[PDB]
Design a binder for this molecule. Structure first.
Ligand SMILES: [Ca+2]
Ligand SMILES: [Ca+2]
Lengths: 10, 279
């Protein structure tokens, strides 16, 4: 997903 | 062409072994392709983009990245120092707010917006979509990414930062997009990276240095720093003429470095994106 740099899709 | 002293994952993308520091790539550098980064937004004014980045849509009052996250991702794709595709064209679609969250309906809408927007955008070499986003399993979210892939867009999506099977996570589990897991400096799957038979490829996702808001830079980890690496590899590969939106994921896996990764669960591919450029 979002905020500050990180990642997702889960 | 050779970028000396390149961030680790760039060099890792042009090498067969770990511990290298130079990034090797064709000087065409993804010119003529366009990458839509769906997210928090993109700081288009970042000099690392050189007038090649651009806000194309918001679902909010502001079309700016007030998080940073989108900018970081868009920089691994195409910034000049941190980017895989150093001359590609970058388009911003703000479906995530400044905290870095968004509802499903708005991120489905943003996927559907690109489907149509790309027809009136000058991208002669092809169009890619990078989705460093995701959440619980959703059949509408998987459907939307399937349509986007189906419209002729190479769709790369994050596996999920849960260290569990990516099958229970929304765009991730869509079998038709290119689902990206993360790896570290030492050729191990990143500890937080999801796995599962749904993944197609792994990219560098740990301690990934890129652009940040405020004309600056920042280093962060996640399946989200891994996605844009394979997103920029596609645009670069598509601009080389080697593959196209429809065949791209298959071609990247078929040419990946195989069996190099450790800590890979059984049933998960052991493939790491590779640009195949020896000098
Ligand atoms: Ca797939
Ligand atoms: Ca590689």
């Amino acid at each position: 997903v979002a905020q500050g740099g990180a990642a997702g899709l889960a | 062409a050779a970028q000396t002293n390149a961030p680790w994952g760039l060099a890792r993308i042009s090498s067969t072994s770990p511990g290298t520091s130079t990034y090797y790539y064709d000087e065409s550098a993804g010119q003529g392709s366009c990458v839509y980064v769906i997210d928090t937004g993109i700081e288009a004014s970042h000099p690392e983009f050189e007038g090649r980045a651009q806000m194309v849509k918001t679902y909010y009052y502001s079309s700016r990245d007030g998080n940073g996250h989108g900018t970081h991702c868009a920089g691994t794709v195409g910034s000049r120092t941190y980017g895989v595709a150093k001359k590609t064209q970058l388009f911003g679609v703000k479906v995530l707010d400044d905290n870095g969250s968004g509802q499903y309906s708005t991120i489905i809408a943003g996927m559907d917006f690109v489907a149509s927007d790309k027809n009136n955008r000058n991208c002669p070499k092809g169009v890619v979509a990078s989705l460093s986003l995701g959440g619980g399993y959703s059949s509408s979210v998987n459907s939307a990414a399937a349509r986007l892939q189906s419209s002729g867009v190479m769709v790369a999506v994050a596996a999920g930062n849960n260290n569990a099977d990516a099958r229970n996570y929304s765009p991730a589990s869509e079998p038709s997009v290119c689902t990206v897991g993360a790896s570290d400096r030492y050729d191990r799957r990143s500890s937080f990276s999801n796995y599962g038979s749904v993944l197609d490829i792994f990219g560098p996702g740990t301690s990934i240095l890129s652009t940040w808001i405020g004309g600056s830079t920042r280093s962060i980890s996640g399946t989200s720093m891994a996605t844009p690496h394979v997103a920029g590899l596609a645009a670069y590969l598509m601009t080389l003429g080697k593959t196209t939106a429809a065949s791209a994921c298959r071609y990247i896996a078929d040419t990946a470095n195989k069996g190099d990764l450790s800590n890979i669960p059984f049933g998960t591919v052991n493939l790491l994106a590779y640009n195949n450029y020896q000098a």
